[PDB]
mmCIF file of C-alpha atoms in Angstrom:
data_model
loop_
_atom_site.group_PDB
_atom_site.id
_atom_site.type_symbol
_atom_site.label_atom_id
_atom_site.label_comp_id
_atom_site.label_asym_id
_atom_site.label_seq_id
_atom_site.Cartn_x
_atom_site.Cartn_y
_atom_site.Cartn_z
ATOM 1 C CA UNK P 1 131.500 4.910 -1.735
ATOM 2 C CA UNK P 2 134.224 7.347 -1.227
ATOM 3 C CA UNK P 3 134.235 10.544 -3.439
ATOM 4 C CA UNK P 4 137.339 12.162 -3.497
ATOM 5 C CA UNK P 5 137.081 16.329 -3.444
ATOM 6 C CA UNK P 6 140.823 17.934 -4.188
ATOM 7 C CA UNK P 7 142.049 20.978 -2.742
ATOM 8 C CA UNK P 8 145.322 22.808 -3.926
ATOM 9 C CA UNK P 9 147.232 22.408 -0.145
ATOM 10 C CA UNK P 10 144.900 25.837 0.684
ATOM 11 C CA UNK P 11 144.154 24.938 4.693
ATOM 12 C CA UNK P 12 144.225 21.225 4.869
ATOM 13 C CA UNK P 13 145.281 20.975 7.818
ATOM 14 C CA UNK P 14 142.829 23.259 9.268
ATOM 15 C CA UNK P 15 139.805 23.040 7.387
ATOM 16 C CA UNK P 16 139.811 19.433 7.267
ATOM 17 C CA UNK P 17 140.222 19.303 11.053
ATOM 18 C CA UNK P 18 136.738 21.619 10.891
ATOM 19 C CA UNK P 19 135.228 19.040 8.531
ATOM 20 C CA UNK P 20 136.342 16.216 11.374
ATOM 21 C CA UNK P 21 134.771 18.153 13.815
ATOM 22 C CA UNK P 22 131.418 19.618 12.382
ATOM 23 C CA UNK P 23 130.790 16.915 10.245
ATOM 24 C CA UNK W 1 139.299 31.817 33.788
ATOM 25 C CA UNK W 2 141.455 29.496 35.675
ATOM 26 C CA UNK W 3 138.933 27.357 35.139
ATOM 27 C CA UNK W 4 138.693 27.276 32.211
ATOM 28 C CA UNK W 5 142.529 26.686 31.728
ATOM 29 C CA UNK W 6 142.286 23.798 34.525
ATOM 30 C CA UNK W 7 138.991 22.185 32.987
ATOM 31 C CA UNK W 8 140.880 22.604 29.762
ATOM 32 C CA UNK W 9 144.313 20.528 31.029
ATOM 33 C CA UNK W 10 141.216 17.964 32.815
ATOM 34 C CA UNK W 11 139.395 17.374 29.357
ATOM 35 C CA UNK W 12 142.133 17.454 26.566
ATOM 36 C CA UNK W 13 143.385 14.445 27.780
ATOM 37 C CA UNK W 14 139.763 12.866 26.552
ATOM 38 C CA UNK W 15 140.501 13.651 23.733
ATOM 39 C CA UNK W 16 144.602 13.569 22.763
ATOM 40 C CA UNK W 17 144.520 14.247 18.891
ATOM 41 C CA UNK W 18 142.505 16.665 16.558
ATOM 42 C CA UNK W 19 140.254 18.377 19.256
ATOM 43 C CA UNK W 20 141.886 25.882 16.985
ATOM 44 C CA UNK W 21 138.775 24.859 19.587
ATOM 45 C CA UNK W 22 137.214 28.436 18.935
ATOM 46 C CA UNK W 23 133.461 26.626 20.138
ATOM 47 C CA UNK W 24 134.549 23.406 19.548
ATOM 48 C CA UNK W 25 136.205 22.669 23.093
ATOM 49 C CA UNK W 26 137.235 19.520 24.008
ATOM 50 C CA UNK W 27 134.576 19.219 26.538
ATOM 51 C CA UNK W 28 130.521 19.200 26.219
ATOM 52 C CA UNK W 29 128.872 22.161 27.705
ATOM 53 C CA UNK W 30 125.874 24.409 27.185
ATOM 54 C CA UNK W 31 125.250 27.834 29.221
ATOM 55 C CA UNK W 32 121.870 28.390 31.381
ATOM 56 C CA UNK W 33 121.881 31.991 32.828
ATOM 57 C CA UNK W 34 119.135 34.571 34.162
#
């Protein structure tokens, strides 16, 4: 079940490449 | 150093998308020392 958590554009591109790669 | 730029060119090709590296290199290591 996907849960969706929203971010205003702060560091997508960055922080969600640190979720990918701690996570 | 220059290995760590060659070993670097030899392992991001493992990889060849998402993985800054900071600590999270493209290649598995751990240090042992004295």
């Amino acid at each position: 079940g996907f849960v969706a958590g929203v971010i205003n554009r702060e560091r997508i591109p960055t922080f969600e490449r640190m979720l990918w790669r701690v996570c | 150093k220059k290995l760590r730029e060659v070993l670097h060119e030899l392992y991001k090709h493992l990889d060849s998308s998402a993985a800054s590296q900071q600590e999270y290199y493209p290649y598995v290591y751990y240090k042992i020392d004295c």
